[PDB]
């Protein structure tokens, strides 16, 4: 990728953790815009939907989820992209909690305001993105909602990418390995806090592995880490081969390369994000 908006960050712990196949960590320079989008999402959520208590979404102590996972996000789209990602965190927690009339009406007002902002930035890519977003708005083999669809919609909007229709099936199929690696790492780092929250009241790969093999948490963590490494290594190999052949469109290769930084960025963010820190646990989280 020809980097214009991000910088590489040295984080030696990633080498020792060995979950990211040596992919470098990159962070968008416009962290301040990401954090502004997060704060506006919180302000709107409290205005339209409900009170926040002990809620943490994409913000981290140094960088946020979007700045690390979409490092080449277009600067003038960062605030809107971060808002939408934070909205998704809020909406997903409320949907988990649930699974009232004025809060659901408030949530559609908040969606409409976001849709208007996106349409004002990029009409055609907004339509691709919201069609991708439509749904959202025993063993490890059956364990796996289409969260890839949210991220596909967000990245293509964030970087003004248009995937040719004739490449979409292939690109989405190859991206699945990056989503599996990042998603398994996510479950690996969220399990402890999730178990704490459930025991005070778990669809997580750690839990699924423990049941499937009748093993302890740390034994399941090792199994999960081995799977993460397989998925990430396969993805890195595929992207490397596609970039060397240079046959796919620039936009499809940009999306797949961004999948690399989604792996390194989400893993680095998981380490100390308050969302998964046990220290930030509260009783009666809202949403």
**What is the binding site for Ni ion (CB under 5 A)?**
237-238, 241
Min separation Cβ 256 and Ni ion, Å = 12
Q: Which residue is nearest to Ni ion (CB)?
A: 241
Instruction: From 59, 3, 5, 2, select the one nearest 28 (Cα to Cα).
Output: 5
Q: What six digits make up the tokens of 195?
A: 């178990």
Would you state the structure tokens that stand for residue 261, as one six-digit string? Answer: 């930084």
Residue 157 or 235 having the CB closest to Ni ion: 235
**Contact by Cβ (8 Å): 149, 131:** no
Find the shortest distance in angstroms from Cβ 3 to Ni ion. 24
Cβ proximity to Ni ion, 222 vs 241, nearer residue: 241
Shortest distance, position 240 Cβ to Ni ion, whole Å: 7
Q: How far is the CB of 284 from Ni ion (least distance, A)?
A: 48
CB nearer Ni ion, residue 234 or residue 285: 234
Q: With respect to Ni ion, which residue has the nearer C-beta, 135 or 241?
A: 241
Listed residue (275, 265, 287) closest to 19, CA to CA: 265
Would you say 188 or 236 has its CB closer to Ni ion? Answer: 236
| Closest approach of Ni ion to the CB of residue 243, in Å | 11
> Residue 239 Cβ, how far from Ni ion at the closest point, in Å?
9
CB atoms within 10 A of CB 93: 17
Alpha-carbon distance of 73 to 113, in angstroms, equals 21
Compare residues 119 and 233 and give the one whose CB is closer to Ni ion: 233
Nearest of 32, 25, 77 to residue 264 by alpha carbon: 25
Peptide bond into 183 cis (omega under 30): no
């Amino acid at each position: 990728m020809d980097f214009k908006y991000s910088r590489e960050l040295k984080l030696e712990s990633l080498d020792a953790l060995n979950l990211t196949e040596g992919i470098p960590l990159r962070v968008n320079e416009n962290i301040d815009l990401e954090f502004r989008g997060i704060e506006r999402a919180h302000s709107d959520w409290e205005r339209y939907v409900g009170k926040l208590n002990g809620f943490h979404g994409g913000r981290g102590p140094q960088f946020g989820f979007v700045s690390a996972c979409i490092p080449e996000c277009l600067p003038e789209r960062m605030e809107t992209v971060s808002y939408a990602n934070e909205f998704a965190f809020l909406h997903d927690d409320m949907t988990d909690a649930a699974s009232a009339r004025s809060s659901a009406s408030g949530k559609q007002q908040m969606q409409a305001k976001l849709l208007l902002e996106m349409l004002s930035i990029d009409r055609e890519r907004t339509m691709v993105t919201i069609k991708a977003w439509a749904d959202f708005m025993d063993e490890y083999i059956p364990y796996r909602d289409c969260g890839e669809k949210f991220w596909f919609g967000l990245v293509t909007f964030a970087m003004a990418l248009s995937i040719p229709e004739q490449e979409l099936e292939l690109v989405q199929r190859l991206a699945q390995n990056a989503y599996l690696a990042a998603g398994l790492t996510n479950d690996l780092y969220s399990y402890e806090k999730e178990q704490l929250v459930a025991e005070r009241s778990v669809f997580n790969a750690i839990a699924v592995i423990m049941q499937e093999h009748s093993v302890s948490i740390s034994e399941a963590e090792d199994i999960c880490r081995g799977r993460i490494r397989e998925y990430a290594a396969k993805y890195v190999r595929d992207v490397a081969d596609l970039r060397a052949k240079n046959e796919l469109s620039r936009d499809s290769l940009a999306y797949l390369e961004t999948g690399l930084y989604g792996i390194s960025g989400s893993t680095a963010w998981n380490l100390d994000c308050p969302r998964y820190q046990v220290s930030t646990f509260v009783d009666f989280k809202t949403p």
